[PDB]
Structures are given as C-alpha cells and as structure tokens.
Design a protein around this ligand. Structure first.
Ligand SMILES: *[C@@H]1O[C@H](CO)[C@@H](O[C@@H]2O[C@H](CO)[C@@H](O[C@@H]3O[C@H](CO)[C@@H](O)[C@H](O)[C@@H]3O)[C@H](O)[C@H]2NC(C)=O)[C@H](O)[C@H]1NC(C)=O
Ligand SMILES: *[C@@H]1O[C@H](CO)[C@@H](O[C@@H]2O[C@H](CO)[C@@H](O[C@@H]3O[C@H](CO)[C@@H](O)[C@H](O)[C@@H]3O)[C@H](O)[C@H]2NC(C)=O)[C@H](O)[C@H]1NC(C)=O
Ligand SMILES: *[C@@H]1O[C@H](CO)[C@@H](O[C@@H]2O[C@H](CO)[C@@H](O[C@@H]3O[C@H](CO)[C@@H](O)[C@H](O)[C@@H]3O)[C@H](O)[C@H]2NC(C)=O)[C@H](O)[C@H]1NC(C)=O
Ligand SMILES: *[C@@H]1O[C@H](CO)[C@@H](O)[C@H](O)[C@H]1NC(C)=O
Ligand SMILES: *[C@@H]1O[C@H](CO)[C@@H](O)[C@H](O)[C@H]1NC(C)=O
Ligand SMILES: *[C@@H]1O[C@H](CO)[C@@H](O)[C@H](O)[C@H]1NC(C)=O
Ligand SMILES: *[C@@H]1O[C@H](CO)[C@@H](O)[C@H](O)[C@H]1NC(C)=O
Ligand SMILES: *[C@@H]1O[C@H](CO)[C@@H](O)[C@H](O)[C@H]1NC(C)=O
Lengths: 109, 120, 108, 50, 157, 157, 120, 157, 120, 108
C-alpha cells in the first residue's frame, strides 16, 4: 500500500503580488478593485438629475432667457454641468459670492 | 443569525427560460454551498444540483444534465439559476438551501421559496 | 444519487404514542449520508436529523433514528399534533443528493 | 435610464466592490477611490503544478 | 507536498492511496472547511474597516482665492495618497500571511498523520508513506479520519 | 499541549510530574520571563508611536463661509477615519502575532525537552513523556532546568 | 535607569487604614514583581507580601493574612497598599521593592521609603 | 545553528566539515541567493510605495486670516504625523519578518540535510552530524549539493 | 530588461588616477555581483576583480593587488573604480559586467564600455 | 585564477562545416568553472556557454562543448559568417576569474 499528501492546484491564471514576490499564480482569488463603468450618465436611485446643458448655475438661477426648460423642473438628485457653459450671466457683470452660492445650492434637493 | 431571500414569483411562457436569484441577508463574502430543490404541487421534493464553495464545482442530476446551470457570486453571497426549456411538468416551487459548509452536504437553511408556473 | 425504495405510505396513528416512519435505501450507503426533513402543507421543509444519529439544533427528545446499509428507519418517542407532518429522507453519497416520495402520514 | 447605486462623471459603477478607480468624485453610496491600478487578495494556495 | 495536484477537487488539502480496493483522490473536509472560515472572516474584515460613506463632491474657487484652491487641492491629494498606501499595504501584507497560513495547515495535517500513522508505515520523504501491513478501505479511511487501530497491526515488528 | 491547565499558576508555560516523590505543577520561569519582555516592549511601542499632544479645539464660521466649514469638516473627519483605521489595524495585526508567538515558545520548549530528554523517555503524543527509568526529584528537576545526566541512565537499552 | 518613588509621609489615628502608593519613574507598562517590607525603629526588616507579574497572584505572611491587601495597576507601573487595623506596634517605615522579574524573587530596586506613625 | 560564524564569508548560510581531505567553511549559494531576491524585492517595494513627488512650499497669511493659518497648520502637521507613523510601522513590521525569514531558511536547510543525510549520520544536537562512514570530498559535496548516494554506504547497519 | 551604462571616455596624464562609474538602468536596490575587464588594443581580455553581493568581499588579481580598488553602492546599483598609477601599458578599454547572482561567477550582462588612454 | 595553456591560434576554415576551438586548462578544475564568450572586432564580448555543458539563452543549436579536467574543447555544428569571431574561454575556480589569449580564427 501507499498513502500520499498533497494540495489542490487547478489551471487558473490569477496573478497576485506579495511583500517580496511578484507574478505568482494562485488557484483562487477575489478582486477588490473595480475599473469598469457604463460610460453613460443616467438616473440615480429612482430620481432623475437636472441636465442644465448650455446654462451654468449662474444662468439657471438668474433665469437666463435661453434654457427656459430648466424652470419647469424643480426636483432632482444631483446637478450636471457642461464643462464650458456658453449661456451664463447674459448681461455682463460681477456675481457676488458666486462660488459661495454653489456650496449653498449644492446641498439643495 | 442569517436569512435566505429569493426573488419574487414569476410566470413564463412555455419554451422559455426562467432565472431566480437567491441572496442571504447581510450578504457579505461567503463560501457556504448552495443547491436547489423542486416541490411539485402535492408531491415530494427532488434535488436539482448545487455549488461547492470556492472551488465552484457544479453537479446536476442526470434527469436533465443540460437544462439547469447554477453560478454563485460568492462576494455578494448570491446564487443564480439559468433553467431553460420549461414545460408543463415543470410548474412547481423552487427553494434555495445551504449546507453550512463548503461541500454540498445536508441542508439546514432554507429561503421563503418561489412559485413559478408555465402557461400562455 | 441512488434509487430509494419506500414502503406503503398509509401509516395512521394517534398522538401521544410511539410512531415509526419507513424509508429504505436500495444499496448500502455511508452512515453519514442520511438526514431527515419535516414539511407541513403550505410551508417549506425543516431539518430533523443529520448523520442518521445526530439530532439537529432546537429539536426535542421526541425524535430518534437508527439504521445501517438498507434497514434505515426512525421512530417517534411521543407523537404530538404539531409534530405530525410529512417526512422526507435524504441520501447523499458524495457530490449528490436525493429525496423520497413522501409518507402519507394520517390521523384516524 | 438606469438604477445604479452610484453616479460618476465618467459613468456609473453599478457594483458594490469596496474599491474603485474610475474617478475620484462620486455621488451617493460609492466605493472608495483608490489610485492603485490593481489589487487582489489570495483565497487559495500558490499554483505550482508539476 | 512537493508538487500540487490537478485531478483532486472539492478540497485544498487531500490524501491519496493505491490499495487494490481502489485508487482515487480524496479531500479532507474538516481541514479545508476550517481554512475557509479564516479566509471568509479575513476578507470580510478588510471590507468592513474600509468605510466608504462620505461626500466627495468637488468645489471651485474664484481667481483671487488661489490659496483656497492650493490648500483644498492638497487635502484631496493628501488623503488619496494615504488611502492608496493603506489599501496596498493591508492587501499585500495579508496575502503573505494567507500563503504561509496554508503551508502550516498542510504541514500540520502531514504531522498529524505521522502521529496517527506510527512507524508501521515507512516514510519516503516526498510527502508519502509506505505501509508494512496490507490495508483495505476500512483501515484506509481510519487514517484519513480521526480514528485509527494501531495496536491491531504489528507486522514486521 | 492539547488543552490548557487551571491548577498551574505563576507561569504561562509549565511542566508536570507524577513521581512518587510528589505530584504537582511547576512553572518555567526562564521561558515565561522571556515572553513577558516582548509583551512589555510590544505594548510600550504602540503607546509611544501613538502621540496625542496636539490642539483639537473646534472652530466656527459664519453663514457666508460655508466653503470653510465643509473644508474644515472634511479635514477633521478625514483624520478621524485614518486614525481609527490605523488604531484597529495595528492592534488587530499585533494580536495575531502574539497568539502565534506563544505557540512557538511552548512548542519550542517542548522540542527543547525532547532534545534533552532522549529516547529513554517514550513519547505518547499528547504533550507527555513516559520514562523507562525511575527518577526522583533530583533527576526530575534536571529535565526541568538546563542540566541533565543522560549517560547515567541506560535502562532497557 | 529607573527610579522608585513612593507617596509622602502620613500619620493616621489608631484603628484606621493607611494607603501608600508606589510608582516607578517613567511608569510605562511594566510587569516586574513588587513587594513591601517593614523596618521598625532600631530593628530589622520583615517581609509583608508581594504581587507576581501579569498573573496578579498575591501571597501574604501568616502574621496578619487579612489586614494587608496589595493590588498593582501594571499599566501605570504602580503598586498600592490597603493596610487596615493599625496599632501602636505598627509604627515603622514601609519600603517598595522590585525583583527584576515577574516572580517574587529577591529584590534589588528600592524606593526612598515612607515613615508612617500612629497616634492621637 | 547555536552560535554564528565569523570565518565563513560569501554566504549567509553555510556548512562545515573536518574530514582528512581538508577542513574549511563553505557557503550554500542556492540558499543564500534565493534569500537575497526576497530582500531586494522587499526593500524595493517599500521605496516604490512611498512616493515623494509633490509640492511642499509653505504659505503665509495676514493677521486677519488666523483661521487659515491654524487650519493650514493642522493639515501640514496632520500629514507629517501620519507619514511618520506609517514610515516607522512599515519598517518595524518588515524587520521582524526578515529576522524570522532567515530562521526558516537556515532551519529549512537543516531539515533538508536531515532528509538527504539519513540515520547513517548521528545527530549531536548542536547543529552538527557525526558520520558512521568515512567520506571524502566526493561524498562531502554530495551532501552539500542536491545529489547523494545513500544506498552505497550501509556501515554499522 | 536591464541596461548597463558607464561614464564617458576620459584621458589622464601618466602617473595619475582614473575613476569610472558603472550604473544600471533603473538602478534601484540591487545585489548582483560586479567586476571589470581590460581589452588591450588588438589583444584578448583579462580579468581585474569584482565585488560579492551584500557581503562586500573584494578580490583582485596578483598582477597589481594594490592599484585597483572597487566599491559598489548597492542602493544605487552602482560600481566605482579607483585605479591608480596608470602607465603606457594601461591604455585599453574597461567594461562593466554582472553575473546575475551575488557571487562573482560567470558574467552575462555587459555595458557599452569605456576607452581610457594615457598620454601628455 | 590559474594559467591556461593555448594551442596555436591558426585555425582557418570555411562556413557551413564543422569547426573546433582549442582551450586547455593547466590543471583540473570543477566542471562548473568554465564559460565561453564571443567577441567581434569593435564590439564587446557576448555569452556563449556556462558550466561547460549549458547553452546560454538566445543561442541556437550550432554550438556545443565538452571536456573535464584538462581536455576542454568545443565544436561548432555548422559555421556561419556571422557566428565567425574570436572566442575566449573563462576559468573561475572560486572568488576569481581568468581568460585566454584569444584564438586567431580566420577565413581562407
Ligand atoms: C473512520 O473511518 C472508519 C473506516 O471507514 C470507520 O469505521 C467504521 O466503524 C463503524 C463502527 O461504528 C462500522 O460500522 C459497523 O460495521 C460492521 C462491519 O461488519 C457492521 O457489522 C456493523 O453493523 C456496523 O455497521 C463501519 O463498518 C466502519 N467502516 C467500514 C468502512 O467498515 C470509522 O467509524 C470512522 N470514524 C469516524 C469518527 O469518522
Ligand atoms: C538543575 O536541577 C538539579 C536537580 O535539582 C540540580 O542538581 C543539584 O546539583 C547540586 C550540585 O551543585 C547538588 O548540590 C550537592 O548535593 C549533594 C547531594 O549529596 C550534597 O552532598 C552537596 O553538598 C551539594 O549540596 C544538589 O543536591 C542537586 N540537587 C538536588 C535536588 O539534589 C542542578 O544543580 C540544577 N542545575 C541548574 C543549572 O539549575
Ligand atoms: C554534487 O557533488 C558531487 C561531488 O562533488 C558531484 O559528483 C561528481 O559527479 C561527476 C559525474 O558527472 C563526476 O565526474 C566524473 O568523475 C569521474 C571520477 O573518476 C571521472 O572519471 C569522469 O570522467 C567524470 O569526470 C565528478 O568526479 C564527481 N565529483 C567528484 C569530486 O568526484 C556531483 O556531480 C554534484 N552534483 C550536482 C548536481 O552538483
Ligand atoms: C482549464 O481552464 C478552463 C478555463 O480556463 C476550465 O474550463 C477547465 O476545466 C480547466 N481544466 C482543464 C483540464 O481544461
Ligand atoms: C509581471 O509583473 C509586472 C508588474 O507590473 C506586470 O506588469 C507584468 O504584466 C507581469 N507579467 C506576468 C507574466 O505576470
Ligand atoms: C447647446 O449648445 C450646443 C453647442 O453647439 C448646440 O449644438 C445646441 O443646439 C445647444 N442647445 C440649446 C438648447 O441651446
Ligand atoms: C447661448 O449660447 C449659444 C451657444 O453658442 C450662443 O449662440 C447664444 O448667443 C447664447 N445666448 C445667450 C443669451 O447667452
Ligand atoms: C446594474 O445594471 C444591471 C443592468 O441593467 C441591473 O440589472 C442591475 O440591477 C444594476 N445594479 C444595481 C446595483 O443597480
């Protein structure tokens, strides 16, 4: 007769790093980092957001003549802005505490 | 203490595929084995198949052997179903079970179950 | 997985007296390849026994079972109306499982 | 239309893993942002087949 | 122990035998199941400690508040550097322990067999033993599980 | 080693004997004292690293400085989250080493006895030895301490 | 280097209880054993009792066996006294000692001592 | 193993012999070289994780902005305290593993010799073996390297 | 992949000392052995000496034994030279080599080399 | 370090045929104390062999070598114009090294 001792070794190809070894294959592993995104902004938690579009916060609050559609909507989860809005304060001027208004307006629902 | 919860009851047209998701309350990372069982109306239970812990080894009865596929997302402590080619005889209740160990040994935890019927 | 023979399910008895349930395996199996589940109409099963000799947690001393190979059988020390139900026997050799038809336990 | 738990300027994460690296800014319950490209935990043994 | 197995499944640690009663791999459920508990508790602990419920929406400042932007930028960058270092260090450190953890279990199991498998079996070094007494399944499973009948066999002694 | 003791006191690691001269537990002062040094130095190191001399008085800001409050709030919350994680990780990590540290000491002591207690004493596995030679207190304490007289006794050999 | 410091001298009425606290300079976490000793005026010393490292096992001489209780807060490296039922014969000097090891073996570190007298 | 060597060089782990063919220390290149790889990879990992590319130029604030200075001061002090704790903890923790790492290697090598050096050589405990068979350089290097000829010699057996 | 880079070509007056620095691309902490070799114009190579890993043990040929000193800053993965008492016969090319292990065994990595000449 | 004898360097041969190179060690040395390097005029050497029996990485099957003690010698399976060069043999007993004079390999 004969008896032997061993351990499992499947054909997986999971690579992990440790203190002083690199690229060591392991039978099983769990991934904790996620790097996949849908790449598509959309509604969150059942409430649609406010697509400001071509009007910045300054244009939205002051009621710019354009982007009139923003007036109708009054409930949202978060505010999304175009990187370079082109319909901000229509009449030239200085908007006092404009940055500080965003923080006040950021938390509103 | 833990609780087993399954998806809601569903009805599917004949010749389609039905998917039922089993999840455990506080479903953090888990390795307990899972299985499934059918309780036909007015008849006794009959085993279907189950998973084995981290190893992810699946075994199914020879009755179908090609129609049911089970995969478990251990990170979320969830077990799925991919039953296909439903028929009239398949109208029964499906239950989610755990054995308390990575193997597929006896079961002592059950969910609320799900009633699935097939008709037009 | 293996076929299991079953005796006739007509077992009529009153509460408060010794009761027995019959479940016969076709072939000899490991003593640690047995269990027992209790199911009542409209509700899912519930564990009774595991290993053919160990009583599950939260089970009183009214349940007992024994058998090896093919003479598997169980007995009830004192039947109670709540404990009355349909009982299923499980067999699991290795990486498999099976159940029985289901005894037709009844009250006269 | 979506039902994602978290929203990000580059999209939605849609999963509940502890870590993410798509974008530092997030809305709602979101995985923490980690600059590491990749990290994993070993659950089994070293694979040295013979 | 010198070299893993591929035919074996359903267990990280298992035995082997070549008796005429039948040759086939087997798994140690008690040993493997205990190891899984630590892994499940270990991975859960990492997730629980790493909380993620907080507000991360960015702010903006005008041109005359350059000091705010640099100070605000440093705070954001500082935490990201800290968390990145903490996340890697904990994960890298835990992986080494897990790899060593398995070695102790398999080695501990091997020693446990040696104690239960007395000198009657000759050790050939490469994680195997040669029996001086012919044994069937009844005796083979005795070594595999926690019951053995050493006094029964005394051949070649 | 399989199962702790309750009658024994004044030492984490100790022996036992059943000779006619007298049965009673004893402690290994040299082994226990060495272990205490590491524990005392280990706990001291944690306290010393975790400095606590700093100012934590909170500030307040008017209504128009909401940016200050949110930025100031994040700084306070950020550090508390970091320190909470650091405090637990260091304590949890050190505890595991301490538990394993004791196992090595007791196991190392057991092996040390084996080397000094040659084959003359039969090992029964459960952390015990059976002597082939009758021994009194003079010989019993020889095994307990660092001096032994193996060549004197050669009975059953 | 370490230094042993005790509380200041105290005087108590007969039939009362006197407490003396022994502390070590830089009193971080410590496990060294502690004890006490009485030096009656013009007479030799006599042991009282001591603690044993982490285990906190206390032994006292049979002379009193119920009147003196010693407990040590190892975290602060302090040893306390709870002597009770003082009498005229008890007027003497109490010293704090360490053995350099968790046991109660010989002592080689001493404090400055404390003189306690009993009178109305 | 009980006591280091000073005459030996060119290796952390080495053997010794006193055969008439010549007495002299030797090094195990395979064992030492493997250990160096972990040390080199271990020290490199610490440096890589500890990034240092960032701006640290200090700022100043007028008298009426005392809140900025206190808040800015806390941010600078907070990070320095965190990094100081992280730097020491990682270095202190890694040192302990390295010291234990060497012990396993030397002890593992000692056990490896025992397996290849069967009972023919008598073990005297203090990290040495006594041979029952006279051996020359050809056999001596057999034990040192990975090839041995045990069946050839059976003297006193 | 790694690359060995040496300092630029240099010319020194007779009776002086010439120093050449050898560095490895991405020169993080390293322990590989280093050595040197001379290739006289139109003649074969001849070994000079080398270092041994962390131990920093140096060996040189008996031809000079006092004129060449090699020290390696392992942290920067650099090897230096301190050759002294140059002469006309010394005009040749010096190469930096590695053995792939802490010892001074055979070499399989080479740099671009450096041409050093001696004249007024 | 030890003196190495060398045969006359005049070895003229054409490509595409078996070729041999001679390098003799004065005294017997360990089989693992040998190597071979290839150098062409104007460029640094390059590894050929290590241990006297193992071919370095990125070396075709056109190189072979054997010998023990003092009869060290090598052969070329099929000479090629690019493979033509001057070859140096290395000896390294322990904590030392040495090279040869250099064969005067030539094309007729
Ligand atoms: C460890 O494994 C061994 C071998 O598998 C187990 O031995 C088993 O011991 C039981 C006794 O409770 C045997 O049952 C009896 O077998 C005799 C055979 O003639 C039969 O006449 C009796 O009616 C009864 O069934 C069992 O046969 C035996 N195993 C085998 C394969 O023969 C042992 O129980 C295991 N221990 C543990 C703790 O798992
Ligand atoms: C370890 O423990 C053993 C046993 O307790 C110690 O043996 C002791 O050895 C000393 C010798 O220095 C004995 O002292 C001599 O005893 C003879 C007995 O006739 C007496 O005639 C002499 O005048 C002298 O006192 C001592 O008796 C002996 N122990 C016992 C119990 O007999 C040993 O010294 C210990 N070693 C260490 C390093 O702790
Ligand atoms: C481990 O070390 C031993 C001892 O140093 C090595 O033994 C060596 O084995 C080779 C066989 O390939 C011997 O070579 C032959 O020697 C005979 C002696 O008469 C000679 O006639 C043959 O022409 C051939 O040269 C070699 O002599 C022998 N060592 C000694 C010192 O005699 C063994 O090869 C080493 N193994 C490894 C894997 O390093
Ligand atoms: C190899 O890996 C594949 C997936 O990568 C898997 O399906 C298969 O079962 C493994 N084993 C064999 C023998 O192919
Ligand atoms: C080896 O590790 C490095 C580390 O960054 C990685 O880039 C590379 O892809 C790994 N290669 C293999 C074959 O695992
Ligand atoms: C918003 O601006 C984009 C930029 O070209 C333009 O194409 C689009 O018509 C604008 N939409 C509205 C509603 O003004
Ligand atoms: C709004 O933005 C569009 C984009 O080009 C521009 O053509 C238009 O003149 C803007 N109108 C106002 C009122 O800002
Ligand atoms: C992720 O997207 C899929 C596809 O629509 C959806 O079924 C799932 O519910 C989403 N996950 C969450 C957490 O909402």
């Amino acid at each position: 007769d004969t008896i032997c001792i061993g351990y499992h070794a499947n054909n997986s190809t999971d690579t992990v790093d440790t203190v002083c070894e690199k690229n060591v294959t392991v039978t099983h592993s769990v991934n904790l980092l996620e790097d996949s995104h849908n790449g598509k902004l959309c509604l969150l938690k059942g409430i649609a957001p406010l697509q400001l579009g071509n009007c910045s916060v300054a244009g939205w609050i002051l009621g710019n003549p354009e982007c009139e559609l923003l007036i109708s909507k009054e409930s949202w989860s978060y505010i999304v802005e175009t990187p370079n809005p082109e319909n901000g304060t229509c009449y030239p001027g200085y908007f006092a505490d404009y940055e500080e208004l965003r923080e006040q307006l950021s938390s509103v629902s | 203490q833990v609780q087993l919860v399954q998806s809601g009851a569903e009805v599917k047209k004949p010749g389609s595929s039905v998917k039922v998701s089993c999840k455990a309350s506080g479903g953090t990372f888990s390795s307990y084995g899972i299985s499934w069982v059918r309780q036909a109306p007015g008849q006794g239970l009959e085993w279907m198949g189950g998973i084995i812990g981290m190893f992810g080894t699946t075994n199914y009865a020879q009755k179908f052997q090609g129609r049911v596929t089970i995969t478990a997302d251990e990170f979320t402590s969830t077990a799925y179903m991919e039953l296909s080619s439903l028929r009239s005889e398949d109208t029964a209740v499906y239950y989610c079970a755990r054995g308390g160990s990575y193997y597929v040994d006896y079961f002592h935890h059950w969910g609320q179950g799900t009633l699935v019927t097939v008709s037009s | 997985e293996i076929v299991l023979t079953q005796s006739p399910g007509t077992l009529s008895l009153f509460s408060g007296e010794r009761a027995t349930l019959s479940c016969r395996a076709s072939q000899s199996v490991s003593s640690s390849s047995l269990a027992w589940y209790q199911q009542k109409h409209g509700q899912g099963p519930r564990l009774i026994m595991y290993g053919a000799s160990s009583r599950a947690t939260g089970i009183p001393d009214r349940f007992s079972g024994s058998g090896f190979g093919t003479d598997f059988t169980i007995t009830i020390s004192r039947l109670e109306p709540e404990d009355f139900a349909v009982y299923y026997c499980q067999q699991y050799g290795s990486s498999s499982g099976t159940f029985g038809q289901g005894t037709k336990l009844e009250m006269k | 239309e979506c039902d994602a738990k978290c929203q990000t300027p580059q999209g939605a994460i849609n999963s509940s893993l502890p870590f993410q690296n798509v974008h530092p800014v997030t809305i709602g319950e979101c995985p923490k942002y980690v600059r590491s490209a990749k990290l994993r935990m070993v659950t089994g043994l070293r694979n040295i087949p013979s | 122990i010198e070299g893993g197995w591929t035919g074996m499944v359903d267990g990280w640690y298992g035995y082997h035998h070549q008796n005429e009663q039948g040759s086939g791999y087997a798994a140690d459920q008690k040993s493997t199941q205990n190891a899984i508990n630590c892994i499940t508790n270990k991975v859960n602990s990492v997730i629980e400690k790493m909380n993620t419920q907080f507000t991360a929406v960015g702010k903006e400042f005008n041109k005359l508040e350059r000091r705010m932007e640099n100070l605000n930028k440093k705070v954001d960058d500082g935490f990201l550097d800290i968390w990145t270092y903490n996340a890697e260090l904990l994960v890298l450190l835990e992986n080494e322990r897990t790899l060593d953890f398995h070695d102790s279990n398999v080695k501990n199991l091997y020693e446990k067999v040696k104690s239960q498998l007395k000198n009657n079996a000759k050790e050939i070094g490469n994680g195997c033993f040669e029996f001086y007494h012919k044994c069937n399944n009844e005796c083979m499973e005795s070594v595999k599980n926690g019951t053995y009948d050493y006094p029964k066999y005394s051949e070649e002694s």
